[PDB]
């Protein structure tokens, strides 16, 4: 299938109480593989997945230097942006950055991205064409002029289109085995009396990947049903995901309901019945 690689950066200022907290993490799909935390003693880009560990000292040195330079730039930007907005020095503020690329099964570029936020709000972003910028407000307009003036789009396109994909391909191959791939949900139904009136049916989907999935209830098939509960998809902590949907049913009449599970890993959609 297709995959992606993303780097996430977060710099938070804590005025009068030290320097901006800087946290950076690399992603391949949903797997974290590298990280940097300004509070860590090492002050190094650290491995987080077994397949990136085999990288030599040349790799780690260069990553550490380049990630450290990023934090310095964020530090400076924080000051600059506060200035743009006329915000007071006492306030804490956040810069978030995400960039990376998507590639197909053949390892070719599909698209690249780069977007920045200030205090949880769109600030400036590289457009799809990887050639133009979109500024979210008058302040970002300033940054936009600077970045155009500096031809920053060209060198970014050279990375997103070039280096980025080349390394994603390396990562994907290196950790093809260990990297999380298609896993069918393990499904089951549970029964929970609230009264004897009145009982709860819960449909479980466990250990599935990717996270994309569909759980739907039916009474007296084929009759779709709302009035149900449905928790957000959540990570199991081992690369797979969990989810459940529930419905309150009259002690009847439990058996007239069916749960329906859809996931790309299943040969066929599943139908569960109590």
């Amino acid at each position: 299938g297709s995959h992606s690689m993303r780097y996430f950066f977060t710099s938070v200022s804590r005025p009068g109480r030290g320097e901006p907290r800087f946290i950076a993490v690399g992603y391949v799909d949903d797997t974290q593989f590298v990280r940097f935390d300004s509070d860590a003693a090492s002050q190094r880009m650290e491995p987080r997945a077994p397949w990136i560990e085999q990288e030599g000292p040349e790799y780690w040195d260069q990553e550490t230097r380049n990630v450290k330079a990023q934090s310095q730039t964020d530090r400076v930007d924080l000051g600059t942006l506060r200035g743009y907005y006329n915000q007071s020095e006492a306030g804490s503020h956040t810069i978030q950055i995400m960039y990376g690329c998507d590639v197909g099964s053949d390892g070719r570029f599909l698209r690249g991205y780069r977007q920045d936020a200030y205090d949880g709000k769109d600030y400036i972003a590289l457009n799809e064409d990887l050639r133009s910028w979109t500024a979210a407000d008058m302040a970002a307009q300033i940054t936009k002029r600077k970045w155009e003036a500096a031809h920053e789009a060209e060198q970014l396109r050279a990375y997103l289109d070039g280096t980025c994909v080349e390394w994603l391909r390396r990562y994907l191959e290196n950790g093809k085995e260990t990297l999380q791939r298609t896993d069918p949900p393990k499904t089951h139904m549970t029964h929970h009396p609230i009264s004897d009136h009145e009982a709860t049916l819960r449909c479980w989907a466990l250990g599935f990947y990717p996270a994309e999935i569909t759980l739907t209830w039916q009474r007296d098939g084929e009759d779709q049903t709302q009035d149900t509960e449905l928790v957000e998809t959540r990570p199991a902590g081992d690369g797979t995901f969990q989810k459940w949907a529930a419905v309150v049913v009259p002690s009847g009449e439990e058996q007239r309901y069916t749960c329906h599970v859809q996931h790309e890993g299943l040969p066929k959609p599943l139908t569960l019945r109590w």
């Binding site: 930007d77 600077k146 500096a150 970014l156």
Partner: peptide
């Protein structure tokens, strides 16, 4: 691998 240098100051 991250880019060789960061974006110029905002």
């Amino acid at each position: 691998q991250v880019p060789l240098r960061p974006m110029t100051y905002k």
